[PDB]
Write a protein that holds these residues in place. Structure first.
Motif, PDB file in Angstrom:
ATOM      1  N   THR A 100      -4.588  60.794 -55.918  1.00  0.00           N
ATOM      2  CA  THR A 100      -3.455  61.704 -55.670  1.00  0.00           C
ATOM      3  C   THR A 100      -3.810  62.769 -54.651  1.00  0.00           C
ATOM      4  O   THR A 100      -2.911  63.253 -53.924  1.00  0.00           O
ATOM      5  N   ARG A 101      -5.067  63.175 -54.617  1.00  0.00           N
ATOM      6  CA  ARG A 101      -5.467  64.193 -53.613  1.00  0.00           C
ATOM      7  C   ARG A 101      -6.787  63.758 -53.017  1.00  0.00           C
ATOM      8  O   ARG A 101      -7.708  63.361 -53.731  1.00  0.00           O
ATOM      9  N   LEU A 102      -6.900  63.871 -51.693  1.00  0.00           N
ATOM     10  CA  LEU A 102      -8.147  63.520 -51.017  1.00  0.00           C
ATOM     11  C   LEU A 102      -8.400  64.666 -50.042  1.00  0.00           C
ATOM     12  O   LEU A 102      -7.620  64.838 -49.088  1.00  0.00           O
ATOM     13  N   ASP A 103      -9.500  65.404 -50.285  1.00  0.00           N
ATOM     14  CA  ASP A 103      -9.856  66.551 -49.432  1.00  0.00           C
ATOM     15  C   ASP A 103     -11.041  66.186 -48.568  1.00  0.00           C
ATOM     16  O   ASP A 103     -12.171  66.084 -49.088  1.00  0.00           O
ATOM     17  N   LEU A 104     -10.785  65.969 -47.262  1.00  0.00           N
ATOM     18  CA  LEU A 104     -11.846  65.651 -46.289  1.00  0.00           C
ATOM     19  C   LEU A 104     -12.073  66.820 -45.303  1.00  0.00           C
ATOM     20  O   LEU A 104     -12.833  66.641 -44.336  1.00  0.00           O
ATOM     21  N   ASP A 105     -11.418  67.967 -45.546  1.00  0.00           N
ATOM     22  CA  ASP A 105     -11.558  69.087 -44.602  1.00  0.00           C
ATOM     23  C   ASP A 105     -12.937  69.649 -44.482  1.00  0.00           C
ATOM     24  O   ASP A 105     -13.769  69.578 -45.398  1.00  0.00           O
ATOM     25  N   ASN A 106     -13.189  70.298 -43.344  1.00  0.00           N
ATOM     26  CA  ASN A 106     -14.457  70.992 -43.164  1.00  0.00           C
ATOM     27  C   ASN A 106     -15.650  70.053 -43.303  1.00  0.00           C
ATOM     28  O   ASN A 106     -16.569  70.275 -44.102  1.00  0.00           O
ATOM     29  N   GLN A 149      -0.365  56.218 -53.960  1.00  0.00           N
ATOM     30  CA  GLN A 149      -0.007  57.356 -54.778  1.00  0.00           C
ATOM     31  C   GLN A 149      -0.458  58.723 -54.224  1.00  0.00           C
ATOM     32  O   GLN A 149      -0.297  59.760 -54.871  1.00  0.00           O
ATOM     33  N   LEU A 150      -1.097  58.688 -53.044  1.00  0.00           N
ATOM     34  CA  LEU A 150      -1.661  59.919 -52.480  1.00  0.00           C
ATOM     35  C   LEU A 150      -0.554  60.906 -52.145  1.00  0.00           C
ATOM     36  O   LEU A 150       0.380  60.585 -51.403  1.00  0.00           O
ATOM     37  N   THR A 151      -0.674  62.106 -52.645  1.00  0.00           N
ATOM     38  CA  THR A 151       0.317  63.149 -52.413  1.00  0.00           C
ATOM     39  C   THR A 151      -0.225  64.234 -51.421  1.00  0.00           C
ATOM     40  O   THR A 151       0.557  64.858 -50.653  1.00  0.00           O
ATOM     41  N   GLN A 152      -1.539  64.435 -51.426  1.00  0.00           N
ATOM     42  CA  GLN A 152      -2.138  65.540 -50.633  1.00  0.00           C
ATOM     43  C   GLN A 152      -3.333  65.009 -49.889  1.00  0.00           C
ATOM     44  O   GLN A 152      -4.223  64.445 -50.540  1.00  0.00           O
ATOM     45  N   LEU A 153      -3.367  65.199 -48.562  1.00  0.00           N
ATOM     46  CA  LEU A 153      -4.517  64.725 -47.752  1.00  0.00           C
ATOM     47  C   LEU A 153      -4.927  65.797 -46.804  1.00  0.00           C
ATOM     48  O   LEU A 153      -4.110  66.227 -45.998  1.00  0.00           O
ATOM     49  N   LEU A 196       3.243  60.805 -49.993  1.00  0.00           N
ATOM     50  CA  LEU A 196       2.678  61.988 -49.332  1.00  0.00           C
ATOM     51  C   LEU A 196       3.631  63.159 -49.314  1.00  0.00           C
ATOM     52  O   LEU A 196       4.809  63.008 -48.923  1.00  0.00           O
ATOM     53  N   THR A 197       3.149  64.330 -49.741  1.00  0.00           N
ATOM     54  CA  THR A 197       3.940  65.534 -49.660  1.00  0.00           C
ATOM     55  C   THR A 197       3.252  66.642 -48.817  1.00  0.00           C
ATOM     56  O   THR A 197       3.945  67.534 -48.279  1.00  0.00           O
ATOM     57  N   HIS A 198       1.911  66.578 -48.676  1.00  0.00           N
ATOM     58  CA  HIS A 198       1.184  67.627 -47.908  1.00  0.00           C
ATOM     59  C   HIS A 198       0.082  66.974 -47.146  1.00  0.00           C
ATOM     60  O   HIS A 198      -0.740  66.252 -47.712  1.00  0.00           O
ATOM     61  N   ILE A 199       0.026  67.239 -45.855  1.00  0.00           N
ATOM     62  CA  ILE A 199      -1.132  66.835 -45.040  1.00  0.00           C
ATOM     63  C   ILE A 199      -1.535  68.042 -44.192  1.00  0.00           C
ATOM     64  O   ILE A 199      -0.679  68.784 -43.746  1.00  0.00           O
ATOM     65  N   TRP A 200      -2.847  68.224 -44.022  1.00  0.00           N
ATOM     66  CA  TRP A 200      -3.378  69.258 -43.142  1.00  0.00           C
ATOM     67  C   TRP A 200      -4.136  68.622 -42.005  1.00  0.00           C
ATOM     68  O   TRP A 200      -5.017  67.768 -42.226  1.00  0.00           O
ATOM     69  N   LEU A 206       6.065  67.766 -43.912  1.00  0.00           N
ATOM     70  CA  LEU A 206       4.853  67.423 -44.689  1.00  0.00           C
ATOM     71  C   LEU A 206       3.617  68.122 -44.147  1.00  0.00           C
ATOM     72  O   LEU A 206       2.552  67.989 -44.775  1.00  0.00           O
ATOM     73  N   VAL A 207       3.697  68.782 -42.987  1.00  0.00           N
ATOM     74  CA  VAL A 207       2.457  69.208 -42.287  1.00  0.00           C
ATOM     75  C   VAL A 207       2.237  70.689 -42.503  1.00  0.00           C
ATOM     76  O   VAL A 207       3.083  71.522 -42.110  1.00  0.00           O
TER      77      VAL A 207
END
Length: 165
Positions: free
Chosen positions: A55-61, A77-81, A102-106, A132-133
């Motif tokens: 549901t969430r995958l944080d690859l930032d930084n 099912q990913l909602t946040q990336l 997807l609802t949020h991507i950065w 979404l961005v």
């Protein structure tokens, strides 16, 4: 099994561990996968293919220089990336096409290469999904900016060339 990471239920927290690579053996039940604040440059192709529950995958930084094509294709099912604060120049054609939840991507704080026609996928995608961005605080589809810094979604497209890649 939990991987240098700390796991609690379906959350796998590999953040802030000076990691140079995504740990192998991430459980297929994982829903929240934190990989932020590390030193990752390259991902194994297929690394997330079994993580169909994410549901969430944080690859930032990180120091990500490229993503493998298809790397998110199973994550229905990913909602946040989060991909911000990396060294990405483009996004592989079709990379987000299966992300139906997807609802949020950065995407901000990457050196997007708008001179290269490889940017057209990402530019067109942002143009179709501005809601979404997100930036650091709230919605901000203009926060993904061309290196050298017009917003990637505003790339006119006579600006680009397959030769400048």
């Amino acid at each position: 099994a939990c991987p240098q990471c700390s796991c609690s239920g379906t959350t796998v927290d590999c953040s802030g561990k000076s990691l140079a690579s995504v740990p192998t053996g991430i459980p297929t039940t994982t829903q929240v996968l934190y990989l932020y604040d590390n030193q990752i440059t390259k991902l194994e192709p297929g690394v997330f293919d079994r993580l169909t529950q994410l549901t969430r995958l944080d690859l930032d930084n990180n120091q990500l220089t490229v993503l493998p094509a298809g790397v998110f294709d199973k994550l229905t099912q990913l909602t946040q990336l989060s991909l911000n604060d990396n060294q990405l120049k483009s996004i592989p054609r079709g990379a987000f096409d299966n992300l139906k939840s997807l609802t949020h991507i950065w995407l901000l704080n990457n050196p997007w290469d708008c001179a290269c026609s490889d940017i057209l996928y990402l530019s067109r995608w942002i143009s179709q999904h501005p809601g979404l961005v997100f930036g650091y605080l709230n919605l901000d589809p203009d926060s993904a900016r061309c290196s050298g810094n017009t917003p990637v979604r505003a790339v006119t497209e006579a600006s680009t060339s397959p030769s400048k890649c």
